[PDB]
Each structure stands twice: as C-alpha cells, then as structure tokens.
C-alpha cells in the first residue's frame, strides 16, 4: 500500500513542479527583445569646422537623438548648435559649428559624433551612425 | 508512473509554449518596412538668389513636400514662396524668392533645402535630395 | 493544477498596459490579480473591457 | 525559425541601405557642370 | 521546452547581430570618395 | 518529477551555450575587412 | 518510501547527465572553423612559357604558397623558379621559366598551378586560385 | 522501482520517436526543387503579322517549346506554323503567320505567346519569357 500512496503524492509534486516551471518557461517566451535601426548621415566640413547631420530614413524608430561627444559640446558649448538635436524627424537638419571648440573648456575638439535611434515602446536605444572629427 | 505524467504535462508545456512563440514570430514576419523613392532636381540660382525645384520622376511614392529650411521659410516668410510645396505632382514647379530672407526674422539665409516623399499607406517619409544656399 | 497562456505588455509612451490571451490550455476563463485589485476597487474607468 | 527571421532583418536592412544609396547616386547626378 | 527556449535565444541573437552589421555597412554606404 | 528537473537543466545548459555561442558569432561579426 | 528515494536517485542520475552532456555539447560550441580567403593573379605567358604570379590582395590571410604542379617543378627542376614561393607577400612577384620541363625529368609539362592562402593560427589552408598551362 | 523502470520505457520511447522522426525530417532534407532558366527572344512583326522566336541561350534546360496562345493555334491553325515547336534547340528559328488567325474557328488573334523551358530529369517546366500580340 506505500508504494501506491507515494506515487499519488509523487504525481501530486510532479503536477505542482510543472505548475511553477511553466511560469518561468512563459517569463523568457515573451521577452523578444526589439532592436531600432535607422539611417543617418553625419557630414564633417574641413573648410569651415562644421559638422552637418540629416536623417535619411526612419526605418522603424520614430526619433533619432545624437551622443557621444555632443554630450559635452551640448551640456555646455550653448549656441554652437543649431536646430534641435534632441529630437531630429526625417527631413531635418542639424549644423554644428566648430570652431569655437578648440578654446571652450569642456569642449573637446576631437572625439565621435554618434546618432541613437529611440522607440518610446520600451525605451529601446542603438546606434545607427558613427563619425569622428578632429578641429584640434 | 510519475516520469510518464511528468513527461505528458511537459509536452503539454511545449505545445502551449510553440503557440505563445508562434505569434511572437509572426509578428515580426509581418513587418516588412516599405520606404519610398523618387526623383526631384533642386536648383539655386545666385543671379537672382531664387530657388526651383521640380519632380522629374515619381518612382513609388505619390506626392513629395519640402523640408528642413522650408520649414523656417515657409512659416513666416509668406508669399517668398510661389506655388505649392505642401504637394507636388510630377511636372509641377515651385519657385521660392530669397531677396528678403537676409532680413525677414526667422528666415534663415543659410541652411539646407530637402524634398521628402510620402506614403500615405504607412505614413513613411524618406528624404530623396537635398541642396544647401548661401544668400547671407 | 491549470495552465494556459497569457500576454502583458506595459507601454512606456502612454503609460498603458495591454493583456490578451494567446491560449487558453485546459482552463476555461482567466482573470487579472496582484496590483489589479487596488486599481480596480475605486480607479474606476481606467480598466476598460472585462478583467 | 532563425534563418527566417534574418532573412527578414535583412531585407529591411537592404532596403535601407537602398534609400541611403540612393541620395547619394541622384546627389552626383544632378552636378552636370556647365 | 529546450528547443523552444533555444530558438527564442537564437533570435534574440540574430536581432543583436543585424544590429551590429547595419552599422558596419551603414558605414562603407556613406563613403562615396570625391 | 525527474523529467521536469531535467527540462530545467537542459534549459540553463541552452542558455550557457548561446551565450558562449554569441561571442563567437560577433567576432565575425565585426571583421569587415578594409 | 521506494518510489521517492528511486525519484530521488534518478534526480541525481539526471543532474549527472546533463554535467556529462555539457562538455560534449560545449566541445562543439567552441569549434567555429575559419577559412582563409586572398586574391592572387596567375598569367601564363604562351610567347615565351613562362608564368607569372602576383599577390593583388591579402583579405584575411598573412601568407601565400604555389601547390600543385609546382610540387613536382620545385622539387628537382631547380632554378628555373626565381623568387620566393614559399611565402609570397603583397606586392611580390615570383617568376617560373617553363622552356626547360619539355626535357627534365619529373617535370610535368601540364598540369596546374594552385595558390594556397595560409593561416598560422591554427595552420589553415586554403586554395585561392589555380590556372592550368600546357607547353608539351 | 517503478520510476526507474517508467524511465526505462521512456526512453526506449524516445528512440523509437527520434527513429520516426528522423525519416521525416530527411524527407524534407533531399527536395531540394529545380527551377529551369533559358534566354529566348520573341518577336511580332505588324508589317506582315508574323511572329518569330529564337533561342539566344540555353542557360541550364536542355529543350524549349512554345505555350499560352500557341496552344489553341498549335492544335487547328495547321499550317501557320513553320518549324518545330515542341522541341526548339539554340539556334532555331519557329515562325508564326498570323494573317489567317482572325478569320479562322478557335484561333485567338490576340493573346499571349509564351516560351517555357523544359528539364527532363524531373519534369519541371518554367517560364522564360512572354509577349502579347494584337491582330484583331
């Protein structure tokens, strides 16, 4: 009679053990992780020290912001940018002039100047484009 | 018996697991990002500080609109702008006059001027030329 | 025990939160607990269809 | 599965390096220099 | 369940690996030397 | 109840072996030769 | 009591397993075979039989190496190869006079000539390019 | 002892599975379907109604024969056709006079004329080229 009562409370345990792991099986089945891309294109004028960046398509993101060194230029450099970096739609552009770089503290005159692409859905951020420049 | 009723519950696992991961997969086989195309020839006139742009080729898309420094233009600087940039149809002329932008406020004399196609199917924007002007 | 499979998705831009029931397995009806039950005692309308 | 879902990202990733080319082929085929 | 899992990861990868190269034929796409 | 334990484990050893398999593959993905 | 200690016992037969199973699987995992690829001309010159080999590119590879029918030619013909073929670098050039194989022995008047890219890493080769001659 | 045993079972079950589903998977693994391509020229002469199909390249099929609107001439036109349809080797030349098709009985004087390339070893038939006509 033991062995008969231990595999109903065996079965019983094996039931409640699918129970918990098919919860953490569904945790990872819904996790499709989403990736943006983008394309745009950065332009650097050695005539002028002048950095020109438009959004040539949107692919599937919605807004494309720039990082990288225009972290310090931006956070400080004021003026030396114009139009609106934090949110750039297709058909925009941004000019950033350079030449006040080499003498403003915190302004790096070298570096990368690089483009992320941003869906609200998730806050997914990647990057679509690099370029370096030197006004140094 | 409990390695047998184990087995059939983690079949039962699977089974639910394929129909979770079936949509998931779907989802992504259905997103087959469209992106317009189409010609349309920019021309800065220096003897006249005048600006022409036609659309020589329709290609995919079905109407093409300014951007970038139009934006600023077009805003306030009124009737500088002859014909319709909101829509133009292959064969169709706008004609924009750059005297009075040197001292209209908010026009800029410098910048970019870039076409950009629409879809009204998905709502996609992609930009197709772009030419840059100097009347400062 | 019941099994069956259920999608949540919480929406970052609108600050909204979607649930949809991919398979129902052996069970027959699903209802949503946890946080649900504070908000749908007195939040009221911000629940919209059948919970 | 996988292969299939490459294929796909693929796709799309041609198709944007299309529209990126593009601008760039139709910028050279304007300057007909007089 | 293992095969399942092993797909989902599998895509997961593939996403992560076009999102690598985009970036690196984005790269060549934009060189047009004059 | 052993099969289920065994369905986890294999599971872990998934997710080891595509971790370890993703380095591999971005290695090649980055060697775009110039 | 039994059947629980006999789950008990499998548990840990399967924990077992699965450390046996990983190395197999891992062993695999780590095993991703490269192949070494170059681009390397060969011309062979009917006017005065003789054929010319040069290294155009490198791609991936450090090191090219003649096979085939240069086994046989190399081994006893002697001089009549001038250069290094054991190790060509971009740029060089190695020179192979045909005239004399018509008459030495153990020197194939046809055959093939094969160029081998090599890797030291992990001692691969490769063929990259081959081109056949006749001058019986 | 009964879930040593169950495990057993189990595993002889899975060997049996894995035997089944191995045969299937193997079947999808040698279908590997072959597509025939060819280059064939067509062309409608409106000086004389008449219609003229070469074939310029083989490509990788073996034998050309002409479908579509040719069905119904082939079969009561007769005589207005000149050559050999159902086998046309590179080089031929099939030539078609229309002149008679509008006046006689299940003849189409228009339609279209399509060329479709032919691979013994399986039977598979596909399209290289088409052209409509227009003798009404």
């Given at each position: 009679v033991s062995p008969v009562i231990g595999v109903i409370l065996m079965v019983a345990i094996t039931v409640i053990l699918a129970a918990v792991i098919a919860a953490f099986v569904l945790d990872l089945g819904g996790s499709v992780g989403q990736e943006a891309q983008a394309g745009v294109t950065i332009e650097v004028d050695e005539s002028s020290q002048e950095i020109q960046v438009e959004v040539t398509?949107?692919?599937?993101?919605d807004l494309v912001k720039l990082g990288g060194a225009t972290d310090g230029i931006a956070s400080n450099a004021g003026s030396t940018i114009s139009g609106d970096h934090t949110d750039m739609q297709t058909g925009d552009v941004v000019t950033m002039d350079g030449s006040s770089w080499s003498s403003?503290?915190?302004?790096?005159?070298?570096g990368t100047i690089t483009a992320i692409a941003v869906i609200e859905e998730d806050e997914t951020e990647t990057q679509v484009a690099s370029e370096e420049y030197d006004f140094s």
């Amino acid at each position: 009679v033991s062995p008969v009562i231990g595999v109903i409370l065996m079965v019983a345990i094996t039931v409640i053990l699918a129970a918990v792991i098919a919860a953490f099986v569904l945790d990872l089945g819904g996790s499709v992780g989403q990736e943006a891309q983008a394309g745009v294109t950065i332009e650097v004028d050695e005539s002028s020290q002048e950095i020109q960046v438009e959004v040539t398509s949107m692919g599937n993101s919605d807004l494309v912001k720039l990082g990288g060194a225009t972290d310090g230029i931006a956070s400080n450099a004021g003026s030396t940018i114009s139009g609106d970096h934090t949110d750039m739609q297709t058909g925009d552009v941004v000019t950033m002039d350079g030449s006040s770089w080499s003498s403003t503290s915190g302004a790096s005159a070298s570096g990368t100047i690089t483009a992320i692409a941003v869906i609200e859905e998730d806050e997914t951020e990647t990057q679509v484009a690099s370029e370096e420049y030197d006004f140094s």
